[model samples]
Target: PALTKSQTDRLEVLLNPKDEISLNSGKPFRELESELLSRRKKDLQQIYAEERENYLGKLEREITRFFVDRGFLEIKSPILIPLEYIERMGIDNDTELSKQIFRVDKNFCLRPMLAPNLANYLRKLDRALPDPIKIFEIGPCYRKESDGKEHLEEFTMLNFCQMGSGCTRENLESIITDFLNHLGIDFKIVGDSCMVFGDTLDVMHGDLELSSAVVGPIPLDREWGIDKPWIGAGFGLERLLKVKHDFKNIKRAARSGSYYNGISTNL
Candidate 1:
């Protein structure tokens, strides 16, 4: 018989092993299993010796430096935000996206995305700062995402926005290209639609989405008292690393107790 379902599952979690292995009934399962385990143990030792830090942490620092070097001021916003903040993004109880939100209570919930907090900051900082306000934020965002190799319930986001004069769609594309170029990503830009932003320019690598850019002065901005042309993009930091490092599973590139530097701890 082929490898049992449970055995195959164990292989994925413990080793993330090669896909070329056969599942035929004739193979000696016990000996092959033990051999693979020992081989991975040796490989993990070498992997750890070469890189002591996780890819997620390394990418986070590099991305931060990218924004800072480009004169983008870093902003920190609360992880828990008022429900109304989400509503301003046009998500209410009836929206499908709203089902993904992690509600701490009626008034507050774990932030599903960075846009709301950034919008609030923009409204407050507009007069405090001069024209061409450039800022970025890096933090965890929560969502009840479906189980998938590419989806994470909690993931890090790199959100950057520029407001004031000359924030056209052309300039927005330029900024996104620069950001992705700095990360050494092989990517393409395409047009897409967002529930709130309407039209968006998205950056993609192969089949994976790395980031989405929106040029605003859209209806959503009115709620935040934001005017003037603006451009913003939000990136999934783990997804970037996953594409960069060729991680087999996105969780291997996430902050997790189960894995370290793409290697499963359970092994």
Candidate 2:
């Protein structure tokens, strides 16, 4: 049975216990069930929504502080792809990554990863200022995916990187474990290759890849005008939350529908 929007809205505004009396008043069993379920859905919605906001804020604050303490300066990057940025990041190739990009026009598109922009920025900084250039950015990125289940049109990534004397696989592993451990997230390190990063070290929890780091003298870095060794780590926020809470999938924990907002709105 479907609950009408009016009924759900009614269930929402009934803060007074006296008003709650009407839930079962003169109601058939099915109607009463409908109203109660609607209210329950609303209740879960309120709780989960608040948790989402608070969880994200505290996570961001904690992560930022963690990086700052390690001498990593926070920086900003554009979401909209800028002219010449593609060629500079070496993403203009016909690789799988290049195919996933969302193009707004021939030249401009949504930026797919923070790595490229960071590389571009570092090239502008005076090389003599420091050895390991440590910087980070947390922002939105878009990727085209097949429709329904296992698709994310837009997502957030926290990308932290360092170049010069400070950059090393060991340093990255230390930072990643320190942060996730503080969160009480159980993860194990695994080795893999990334489209953007080449050979990489990934942190896995159960089946989820919680984070990935690459300390590079990798060939792609040279394409970004990075003529030196570097280290980087990237994490997807939605996947983090989903894995943290043990949700069935990323959709229920992240996307704006059902359990995330007003539980089981489909009802």
Candidate 3:
């Protein structure tokens, strides 16, 4: 007789374990399933007892402190932004990126990226603050991004921009390198292109991209009311954790109910 529907469902919760046993290896199915369940239960108990907090929380604080020590003022930007701000980033209705925006009504939607808002701050801060203004913001951003192990509908973004003097491309590279060095992550920098910033310098870890950086005094600045040279970088914090610990799925590094600290919560 074949296994019941519920029995097969329980087996699926095992997260593709690398055991010698198989569904058709001639071992008793119920017995094998029970053994795997027991093992998972014990694993969960041990994780609960020993691990107090998720690594994602720790990483956010560490990144914050690293920048603060480097003279970067962290800014808290809004999650909900005006549609005009999105258009300023060159994400108009003509672009495919516009289709992925989560609309709140006819005029506004959730912020897709952090660059536009950061630019708004720089435009004002440049005058009030002295030369070489450095500011950063770390927060959640929403998008109707595609579904994949490496993508998420909502993800955390760490964006920092330096305006005025000392905004050269070399300085941008140095800041990125120093930040990664603080985290002890090995990375490589390469040139890339994007819609908003036509040419960009990307930080990579093996095949995965950890961040994309762009130096400004570009055409977009004219739209935002700033004309000073600047350098900005946007990093995906979950991707950082993914690379740092070799997480099999990006979700393992994000806030989730299905998993806890990269351990599968399914029983």
Candidate 4:
């Protein structure tokens, strides 16, 4: 309703007093322009504190719970590892991934993948670690990633491994697909090869990949002293978020102090 002639003569307070609402609407305004101008002091790197909690943080907990519900033990391992052990996952010179190794010392580099260390972990935990041992890790890995929407130099990885004959290729694939479908992620199975695992079945959403699956406890596992049947899968968290949000750049979530929860922040 329009203000009364006398009422229109008075100034009323507004909630968002700083907003530039039209006077014709009869909404009141406060002179916050000077205050706003002074408050323009920007902290561009302010963490996406609330958004991370609701979005990535919640998503991570749910994913962890998914595996934990399925009986996977969460574990932690070192980040800096020997280059020789890091390459055990097949980062050969011929492969593009081989060139991105962040070598620190003659012996060590930040781990490029979770697979290599997990392979050795199974051997060390043998006997003490139960048969059909199921384990997983959610951690960061580093690489000199090619500047691409799907790649990140520093990223979070969720790698799950089950070292038992029961966790066969078909079994793992079914579980993986079921989980994705349950989460309402539209995906398809695509085939590829990696030096670490000769053949791979990956989850794809249109042009993006959500996860990669491999059946192991193969002959290669024998070299790591893991002599049994097993199946494992790895998901890149940044890539997962990118696909889930249809983001143009993974760094929106991958990098520190950037856009989050689909909201662009001041840079």
Please report, in order, the local distance difference test score of every candidate based on alpha carbons: 0.82, 0.70, 0.83, 0.70
The parts of candidate 2 lying over 4 Å away from their true place are 1-54, 87-95, 126-128, 147-151, 255-267
lDDT string for model 4 (69-184, tens) is 88888778888989887556656667577788898879899888888878777676667867878888888899896578678899888898888657787888888877787677
Identify the candidate with maximal TM-score.
Answer: 1
- The segments of candidate 4 whose C-alpha lies over 4 angstroms from its true place after superposition are 1-54, 93-95
User: What's model 4's lDDT at 96?
Assistant: 75
User: Which 10-residue span in candidate 3 carries the lowest summed lDDT?
Assistant: 12-21
Q: Report per-prediction Cα RMSD to one decimal.
A: 2.1, 6.8, 3.2, 10.3
| Model 2 C-alpha lDDT per residue in residues 1-267, reported as the tens digit of each score | 455677645444332222334543556546665666667666667777666554445566777888888888888888997746666665657756677878887789898778878887777663655766888888778887664433467777899887778676777888888878877888899998866567889888876777778888887766678877778888877677666665444554444544433244454
Q: After best superposition, candidate 1 residue 152: deviation in angstroms?
A: 1.0
Q: What lDDT does candidate 4 reach at residue 259? A: 46
Worst 10 residues of 1 by lDDT: 16-25
Sorted on lDDT, highest at the top, how do the candidates line up?
A: 3, 1, 4, 2
What TM-score should be assigned to candidate 3?
A: 0.86
Candidate 3: list runs displaced more than 4 Å.
Answer: 1-47
Residue 251 displacement (Å), model 2: 1.8
Candidate 1 residue pairs in backbone clash: none
lDDT tens digits, residue span 222-266, model 3 = 988888899999999999988787676787778788766666677
